[PDB]
Scaffold this motif. Structure first.
Motif, mmCIF file in Angstrom:
data_model
loop_
_atom_site.group_PDB
_atom_site.id
_atom_site.type_symbol
_atom_site.label_atom_id
_atom_site.label_comp_id
_atom_site.label_asym_id
_atom_site.label_seq_id
_atom_site.Cartn_x
_atom_site.Cartn_y
_atom_site.Cartn_z
ATOM 1 N N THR A 92 -7.845 -11.612 -0.007
ATOM 2 C CA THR A 92 -8.456 -11.184 1.246
ATOM 3 C C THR A 92 -7.645 -11.609 2.462
ATOM 4 O O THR A 92 -7.889 -11.102 3.563
ATOM 5 N N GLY A 93 -6.690 -12.521 2.295
ATOM 6 C CA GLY A 93 -5.879 -12.984 3.404
ATOM 7 C C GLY A 93 -4.768 -12.028 3.784
ATOM 8 O O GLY A 93 -4.936 -10.807 3.711
ATOM 9 N N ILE A 94 -3.622 -12.576 4.198
ATOM 10 C CA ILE A 94 -2.500 -11.738 4.601
ATOM 11 C C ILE A 94 -1.910 -11.060 3.376
ATOM 12 O O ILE A 94 -1.648 -11.705 2.352
ATOM 13 N N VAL A 95 -1.701 -9.754 3.470
ATOM 14 C CA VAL A 95 -1.020 -9.010 2.416
ATOM 15 C C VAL A 95 0.482 -9.209 2.569
ATOM 16 O O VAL A 95 1.050 -9.021 3.652
ATOM 17 N N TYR A 96 1.125 -9.632 1.487
ATOM 18 C CA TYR A 96 2.545 -9.944 1.479
ATOM 19 C C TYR A 96 3.331 -8.817 0.822
ATOM 20 O O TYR A 96 2.800 -7.742 0.532
ATOM 21 N N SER A 97 4.622 -9.078 0.598
ATOM 22 C CA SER A 97 5.521 -8.034 0.114
ATOM 23 C C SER A 97 5.073 -7.485 -1.235
ATOM 24 O O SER A 97 5.013 -6.264 -1.425
ATOM 25 N N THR A 98 4.754 -8.362 -2.181
ATOM 26 C CA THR A 98 4.335 -7.929 -3.506
ATOM 27 C C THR A 98 2.823 -7.901 -3.675
ATOM 28 O O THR A 98 2.342 -7.604 -4.774
ATOM 29 N N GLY A 99 2.064 -8.199 -2.624
ATOM 30 C CA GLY A 99 0.619 -8.226 -2.742
ATOM 31 C C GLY A 99 0.071 -9.456 -3.427
ATOM 32 O O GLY A 99 -1.055 -9.426 -3.932
ATOM 33 N N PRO A 151 6.050 -11.476 4.139
ATOM 34 C CA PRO A 151 5.016 -10.460 4.367
ATOM 35 C C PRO A 151 5.579 -9.048 4.267
ATOM 36 O O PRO A 151 6.751 -8.802 4.558
ATOM 37 N N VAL A 152 4.721 -8.114 3.850
ATOM 38 C CA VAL A 152 5.112 -6.712 3.792
ATOM 39 C C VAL A 152 5.139 -6.141 5.207
ATOM 40 O O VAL A 152 4.612 -6.741 6.155
ATOM 41 N N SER A 153 5.754 -4.971 5.358
ATOM 42 C CA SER A 153 6.151 -4.505 6.679
ATOM 43 C C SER A 153 5.075 -3.655 7.349
ATOM 44 O O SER A 153 4.347 -2.893 6.701
ATOM 45 N N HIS A 154 4.996 -3.788 8.676
ATOM 46 C CA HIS A 154 4.182 -2.887 9.480
ATOM 47 C C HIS A 154 4.622 -1.440 9.332
ATOM 48 O O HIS A 154 3.817 -0.533 9.566
ATOM 49 N N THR A 155 5.885 -1.204 8.968
ATOM 50 C CA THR A 155 6.324 0.147 8.639
ATOM 51 C C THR A 155 5.601 0.679 7.408
ATOM 52 O O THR A 155 5.254 1.865 7.358
ATOM 53 N N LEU A 156 5.364 -0.175 6.412
ATOM 54 C CA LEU A 156 4.627 0.230 5.224
ATOM 55 C C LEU A 156 3.118 0.152 5.407
ATOM 56 O O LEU A 156 2.384 0.638 4.540
ATOM 57 N N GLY A 186 0.761 -7.913 15.049
ATOM 58 C CA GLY A 186 2.008 -7.654 14.365
ATOM 59 C C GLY A 186 2.032 -8.060 12.908
ATOM 60 O O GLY A 186 3.037 -7.814 12.230
ATOM 61 N N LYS A 187 0.962 -8.671 12.406
ATOM 62 C CA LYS A 187 0.859 -9.067 11.009
ATOM 63 C C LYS A 187 -0.119 -8.137 10.305
ATOM 64 O O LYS A 187 -1.232 -7.914 10.793
ATOM 65 N N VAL A 188 0.304 -7.586 9.171
ATOM 66 C CA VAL A 188 -0.562 -6.723 8.376
ATOM 67 C C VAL A 188 -1.424 -7.589 7.462
ATOM 68 O O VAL A 188 -0.924 -8.480 6.767
ATOM 69 N N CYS A 189 -2.739 -7.362 7.494
ATOM 70 C CA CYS A 189 -3.688 -8.170 6.742
ATOM 71 C C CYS A 189 -4.840 -7.302 6.258
ATOM 72 O O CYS A 189 -5.280 -6.382 6.951
ATOM 73 N N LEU A 190 -5.329 -7.608 5.054
ATOM 74 C CA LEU A 190 -6.475 -6.881 4.519
ATOM 75 C C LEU A 190 -7.722 -7.122 5.361
ATOM 76 O O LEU A 190 -8.388 -6.173 5.791
ATOM 77 N N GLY A 191 -8.054 -8.388 5.605
ATOM 78 C CA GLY A 191 -9.229 -8.727 6.384
ATOM 79 C C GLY A 191 -8.904 -9.384 7.709
ATOM 80 O O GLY A 191 -8.515 -8.711 8.668
ATOM 81 N N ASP A 192 -9.059 -10.702 7.771
ATOM 82 C CA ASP A 192 -8.782 -11.479 8.968
ATOM 83 C C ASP A 192 -7.409 -12.129 8.850
ATOM 84 O O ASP A 192 -6.942 -12.435 7.750
ATOM 85 N N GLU A 193 -6.766 -12.330 10.002
ATOM 86 C CA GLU A 193 -5.439 -12.936 10.016
ATOM 87 C C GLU A 193 -5.473 -14.345 9.439
ATOM 88 O O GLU A 193 -4.585 -14.736 8.674
#
Lengths: 190, 245
Positions: free
Chosen positions: B138-145, B155-160, B176-183
């Motif tokens: 539920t936290g920050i989504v990273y490159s591989t999830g 972290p995975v990209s705002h482009t993606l 600027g940080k991609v996250c599933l729920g809250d930062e």
RNA sequence: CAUCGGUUCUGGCGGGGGGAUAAAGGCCCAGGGAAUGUGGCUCCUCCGGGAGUGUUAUAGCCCUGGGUGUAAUACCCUCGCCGGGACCGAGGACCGCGCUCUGCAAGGAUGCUGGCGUAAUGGUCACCAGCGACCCGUCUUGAAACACGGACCAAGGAGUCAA
RNA sequence: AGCGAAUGAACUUUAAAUAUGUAAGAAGCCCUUGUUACUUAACUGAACGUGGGCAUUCGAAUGUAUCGACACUAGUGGGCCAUUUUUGGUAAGCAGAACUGGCGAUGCGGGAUGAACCGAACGCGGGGUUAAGGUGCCGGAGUGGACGCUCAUCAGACACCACAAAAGGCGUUAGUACAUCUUGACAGCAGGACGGUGGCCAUGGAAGUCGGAAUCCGCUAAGGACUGUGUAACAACUCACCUGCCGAAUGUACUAGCCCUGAAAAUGGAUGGCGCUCAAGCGU
RNA sequence: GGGAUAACUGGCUUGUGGCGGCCAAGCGUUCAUAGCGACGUCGCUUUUUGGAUGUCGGCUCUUCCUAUCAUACCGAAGCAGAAUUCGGUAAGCGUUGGAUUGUUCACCCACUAAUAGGGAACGUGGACCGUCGUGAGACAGGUUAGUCCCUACUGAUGAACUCGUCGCAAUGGUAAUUCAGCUUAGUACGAGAGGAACCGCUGAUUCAGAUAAUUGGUUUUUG
RNA sequence: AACGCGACGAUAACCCGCACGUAGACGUAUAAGAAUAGGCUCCGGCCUCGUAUCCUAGCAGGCGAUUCCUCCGCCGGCCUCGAAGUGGCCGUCGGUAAUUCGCGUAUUGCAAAGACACGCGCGGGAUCAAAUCCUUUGCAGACGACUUAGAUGUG
């Protein structure tokens, strides 16, 4: 060219009750009953096999066979609605003013009413009346997300569009002001 | 009359190959038939075919072909009356689907052993069965999830981010940080892309491809082999199991 | 109203001729061929329904030639017969042309019956109704268009007479 | 037309169309013989005189309510429009000749109506049949028949065009020429979409994708020193192209019809009106 | 002096130049070359440092068109906000001055939401007879040419339908306009400077229909 | 709407006189709705066709039977009908070929002015119920026009 004959087939599952008296396609399923009048087009209905309905045109035009295709699709959507039903996962976003959404069953007329408050801070309360037969719930799995579930695809989609249209920004830069309530997922209940 | 698609012309150098390419394929297979002795026939049912290039580089000695199954089969000669060499009609009736040919000059037992030892990890194709309930926190989504530990994960990209949102993840790009729920985290619950035993669809396969999660095994199944001298084909395992026409 | 004469409209009927002596078509005879393939056979999610096969079988079709046959029918041309309707009766001794010849439908309507005087049939005025329809004279112009005269009625009112 | 005839519209055996000049016996012909005032070398011509033949096809057809002469007697002596031909000119207008026709001195049916359109000419009547034009009603006559096309946010409506263009139309139908197609056509879905190589010049940095040039090879089933998205550069996505699934016509440019737009102001009005949509519109 | 035309336009008018070359589908004398030929591009106008207007008008009023100045609505723009620009749907609404000038517009400045453009049969209130001159003209010389009717409309009445009361509504007209203040809020936004909008409330301009409780004004009430 | 309509209130009936009797009837008969790529039904079945149904005989339609209780019509009661207002049922009374007869029809020649009653009318007379004129009022008025008040009274 005045095509002599053309036909299309619609398969029905084992657990439905379809009836066309004059042109009132009434389909009965586990969740409820969906009735639509198709009196505006010229089609011949038959039961071509045990569980497939054949809809045909005789001495018709390309526009008529196009009408056959689209009415086939509408009937298939009714079948899908009475078998699985439709779900629309709706998402809302805010930047600094949290949007408040409240859904209530207005008992008279038996209809949902959705009220939206604090949309970009406007004191106006946007109240939208909800389509008959479709249910609205505030999703608990994800945050700032609503669920619109129903049997009628047309009703649920029109209601979702009504929400996405009533929550529209005026006289502001859309590039900067990103607030609004937006469609996220469109699928089946099952 | 009117009311037709506006055909989008392709302003690009590469063109249709066509009849010339197909007759080139007949010529290539027909001329490469005589030199080699063991014509193996293999299948790659539902695996991505990147590593065929690597197996080519490994078996530099041999010659491998893969096109239209019908085109290659008739280049061999489906009917025995029009047949390059006896038993090649049997090879044609073996040739059914996602099937390739392998002209070799060396030991069939060694070929079988190498192709049994061949095994690579790969991103799953559509239609397979998922073995794991892989999910993202539920936290920050990273490159591989979250497959690799988050402390060592970029972290995975705002482009993606827009692609993930389009393909269904209820993800938001905040500060600027991609996250599933809250930062900070928590708030939401999580997103399970696929479950154990679930038949993976195109959406989930693209999700694993984006999050660099491999759950398929690239392996080549040798249907059979035809010897030039004997003029016959011997089916092995996959040969009898895989339906053919 | 009946029989007629002239003009005319409109229905039906008996024939004759011509075509490629119609083409077709029915029935036969003979040869050939084919599928949108009849029967049969095989496969086939079997009230059923497909697919392949193969030329008449438990349906038939097409092409060619012959007979019935100088067939019938359509179309065109043509010899006539009957029926219903409309308008008119012009002339007034005979003559002529003729014919189906004791007189006739032959150089033009007669015959029979009925109605008609407190009203047959008419006239003027007024009105309604259908259709039509610029106000006359003068003058100009290719033509219009302008322009001149007209409040009305009665009487007068203008190519005449000489050499 | 031919030039397998010659020669070369200016070629021709032949020969158009098309209008337009002259002749078709008796008052006419031919020649013979003479004179002359004329003429010529000369009855060579001209006129004047002889001769002959052929009058019941006297020398094509048709028409025949007659023609010729002299004398005398009124009124008139403008033009307008159009067809065709012809000459000149403009951006377009137009201007000038010749023929014919119509109106001018002409009533009548039709074009809703009218100097220039179509038919047809005139005593008073009865009956019949037509032309132009019409048969949904006004309006007398068909909601007649056959095949198709067209839906116009002021369609179109019968004897006419400018706007107008190799004009825009993801309206609709017919048609033409090319190209793919079980060797699986177009579209779609699952994929691959590589290696040398972060190619060469440039520079905070530019890796196929801010810039100039070249644009090659391996693997190939195919993959461009790359079509866009995107990064500070990457990355990544996507495109071209290629294989797997499905299975039967397509798809590129044009021609022709009907329809939209192809330009519109100021009082409220016009296929004549109503109105008409497998027409009461359009073609036969 | 003669001749000729009686006179102009009436599906006319608008927003995108001309000349030459290149290209150019088609058509053509027989074929894209006897040649005609759109859109584009190139060369000239056109590039290396930022006043024109003669007679006129001036005011008001009615009506209409939109080719829309503002109000309303949305589409697009580095449109952060505010303030804007372009585009279109829209004629209900309203659409003021000063300078300057012969006088108008341009430009200039003042208000103001804004000071938009037009139509209404361009809506209602001299020329010879001559005389004196011919290298050019003049003439106190003349002949002289030169127009109160009908009716629509509105209001008020109005004959017959027995008189009167209470009603219906076919039809015709139709009316509201703009600005401001409080709250939202010194918030959203923003480096700063600055700085919104919805909901709700209160006023003001113009227009329209009323009224004299109170305040000015008017006195054949001659008090 | 002054030539569109409705509801309501209040009236004009008697005496004498005198004047006349179809912009188109001749069986002028017929109520489902709704759809037309469906409908009707009796639930059997039925639907191109209103080319149907009803009615339809008697002196311009008599008399008497025969014989039938079938329709028609008039009045009452019960209810019913209001979009621009009626029908059913019951009852009374009158008429009534479904059947079958005997009496009369003529010469109107083969088709083309009497009496009574009922109404609409006018000329006078008197009868209601009103309106207008007159006076007054002034919420009104170019003039018409309009609001009131005049017969016993809150005049």
């Amino acid at each position: 060219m005045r095509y002599i004959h053309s036909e299309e087939t619609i398969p029905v599952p084992e657990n439905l009750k379809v009836s066309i008296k004059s042109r009132l396609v009434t389909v009965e399923g586990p969740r409820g009953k969906l009735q639509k009048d198709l009196s505006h087009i010229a089609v011949n209905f038959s039961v071509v096999k045990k569980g497939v309905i054949g809809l045909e045109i005789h001495h018709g035009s390309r526009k008529d066979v196009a009408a056959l295709r689209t009415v086939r699709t509408i009937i298939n959507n009714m079948i899908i609605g009475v078998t699985k039903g439709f779900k629309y996962k709706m998402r809302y976003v805010y930047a600094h003013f949290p949007i408040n959404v409240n859904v209530e069953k207005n008992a008279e007329t038996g209809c949902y009413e959705v009220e939206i408050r604090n949309f970009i801070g406007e004191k106006i309360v946007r109240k939208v009346v909800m389509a008959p037969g479709v249910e609205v719930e505030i999703s608990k799995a994800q945050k700032d997300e609503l669920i619109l579930s129903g049997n009628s695809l047309e009703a649920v989609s029109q209601s979702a569009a009504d929400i996405q249209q009533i929550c529209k920004v005026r006289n502001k830069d859309i590039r900067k002001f990103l607030d609004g309530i937006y469609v996220s997922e469109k699928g089946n209940i099952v | 009359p009117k009311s037709k698609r506006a055909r989008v012309y392709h302003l690009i150098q590469v063109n249709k190959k066509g009849r010339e390419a197909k007759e080139r394929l007949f010529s290539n297979i027909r001329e490469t038939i005589p030199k080699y002795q063991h014509c193996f026939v293999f299948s790659v049912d539902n695996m991505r075919n990147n590593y065929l290039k690597d197996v080519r580089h490994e078996l530099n000695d041999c010659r491998i072909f893969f096109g239209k199954t019908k085109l290659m089969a008739r280049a061999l000669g489906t009917t025995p009356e029009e047949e390059q060499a006896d038993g090649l009609h049997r090879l044609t009736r073996y040739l059914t689907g996602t099937v390739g040919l392998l002209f070799t000059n060396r030991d069939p037992a060694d070929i079988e052993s190498y192709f049994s030892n061949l095994s690579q990890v790969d991103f799953a194709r559509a239609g397979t069965v998922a073995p794991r309930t892989v999910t993202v926190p539920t936290g920050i989504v990273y490159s591989t999830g979250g497959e690799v530990p988050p402390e060592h994960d970029v972290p995975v990209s705002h482009t993606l981010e827009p692609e993930l949102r389009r393909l269904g993840m209820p993800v938001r790009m905040i500060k600027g940080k991609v996250c599933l729920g809250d930062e900070k985290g928590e708030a939401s619950e999580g997103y399970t892309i696929c479950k154990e035993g679930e038949v993976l669809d195109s959406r989930q396969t693209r999700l694993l491809k984006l999050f660099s999660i491999c759950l398929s095994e690239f392996k080549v199944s040798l249907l059979g082999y035809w010897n030039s001298a004997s003029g016959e084909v011997t089916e092995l395992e996959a040969g009898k199991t895989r339906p053919k026409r």
